[PDB]
C-alpha cells in the first residue's frame, strides 16, 4: 500500500523519459505490502501480448533469484487528462492476481498525481479520491526533483531499451545507486 522512494523515483523518471508516449511497468516487492521498486517494461503501443508475456518470465527469473515478488502494475495514459484504466491494465492485473494477492492497479495522473485501484469482488475501484497513503511525501518530492533537474531520465533504461541492446540493465543499478546517497 506504500511505495518506496526508489519505486516512485523510477516511476517518475520513466514517465518523464517518454512524455509523448505511454508508460508501463511492474512494481516488484520482497516476499502491509511495500513497493520497493519497479521494472519499467515498454512505451508507446502497449496493446500487444507477446512482448508483455515475455517480460513476465524474464522478470520472474530475476526476482526468484533476487528474493523478490511482483506485487503491482502501473500505467500512464498518453493523454494528460484521461487516467481511466484500459482493458490492458485489467488484463495484466488479473494475471498477477493469480500469483500474488493484493494487486494494485496504478494510474499515473499527469495533472497526489497517482491513483491506486484495488479489486474487491466487483471491479477495480480507486482510492485517491478519498486518500492515498505513502511513506513520506516531502522526501519523495525532493529526491524526485533532485534527479529530474539533472536530466537523469536520459540515463534511465527500461525493458524496451533492453530488448534493443542487452548491454542495458533493466534493473536500473545506476539509478537506485544514486538514490541511496540522496
Amino acid at each position: 500500500v506504500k511505495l518506496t522512494t526508489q519505486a516512485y523515483c523510477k516511476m517518475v523518471l520513466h514517465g518523464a523519459k517518454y512524455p509523448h508516449c505511454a508508460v508501463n511497468g511492474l512494481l516488484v516487492a520482497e516476499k502491509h505490502t511495500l513497493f520497493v521498486d519497479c521494472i519499467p517494461l515498454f512505451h508507446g503501443t502497449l496493446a500487444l501480448a507477446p512482448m508483455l508475456e515475455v517480460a513476465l518470465t524474464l522478470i520472474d527469473s530475476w526476482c526468484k533469484d533476487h528474493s523478490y515478488v511482483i506485487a503491482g502494475y502501473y500505467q500512464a495514459n498518453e493523454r494528460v487528462k484521461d487516467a481511466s484504466p484500459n482493458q490492458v491494465a485489467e488484463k495484466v492485473a488479473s494475471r498477477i492476481a493469480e500469483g500474488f494477492s493484493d494487486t494494485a492497479l496504478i494510474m499515473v495522473d499527469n495533472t497526489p498525481t497517482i491513483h491506486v485501484y484495488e479489486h474487491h469482488e466487483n471491479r477495480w475501484r480507486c482510492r485517491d479520491p478519498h486518500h492515498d497513503y505513502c511513506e513520506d511525501w516531502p522526501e519523495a518530492q525532493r529526491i524526485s526533483a533532485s534527479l529530474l533537474d539533472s536530466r537523469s531520465y536520459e540515463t534511465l533504461v527500461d525493458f524496451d531499451n533492453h530488448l534493443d541492446d542487452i548491454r542495458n540493465d533493466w534493473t536500473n543499478p545506476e539509478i537506485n545507486k544514486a538514490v541511496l546517497h540522496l
Binding site: 512524455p19 509523448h20 512505451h43 487528462k81 499527469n110 495533472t111
Partner: protein, 101 residues
C-alpha cells in the same frame, strides 16, 4: 585520409607544367625546323606520371560505394524512431505540464 584532394591538385599542377614544357619544345622545334620532331622523354615521363597519379587520386575522391541490400540500412533502426509520425503529432501529453508548465 582526406589528403587525396591535395594529391589530385599536385597531379594537375604537374600536368599543366608538362603541357607548358611541351608547348616550349614545340615552339623551339618549329623555330629551328628539325626533322626529328620527337618530344623529350623527360617531359613524357612527367606527363605519364602526373596522369597516373591524378587518375588514381580522382578514383579515390569520387566517393565510396553503398551496399545494395536494403536490409542493411535498416539494421540499426528501432521502433522508437518509426512509431512517431511528424504529421499526426499531438501536444496534449504530460511533457507540456511537466517541462515548463
Amino acid at each position: 585520409p582526406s589528403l587525396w584532394k591535395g594529391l589530385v591538385g599536385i597531379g594537375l599542377f604537374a600536368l599543366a607544367h608538362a603541357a607548358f614544357s611541351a608547348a616550349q619544345h614545340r615552339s623551339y622545334m618549329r623555330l629551328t625546323e628539325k626533322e626529328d620532331e620527337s618530344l623529350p622523354i623527360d617531359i613524357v615521363l612527367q606527363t605519364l606520371l602526373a596522369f597516373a597519379v591524378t587518375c588514381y587520386g580522382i578514383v579515390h575522391i569520387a566517393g565510396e560505394f553503398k551496399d545494395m541490400d536494403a536490409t542493411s540500412e535498416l539494421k540499426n533502426k528501432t521502433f522508437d524512431t518509426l512509431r512517431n509520425h511528424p504529421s499526426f503529432y499531438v501536444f496534449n501529453h504530460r511533457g507540456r505540464v511537466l517541462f515548463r508548465p
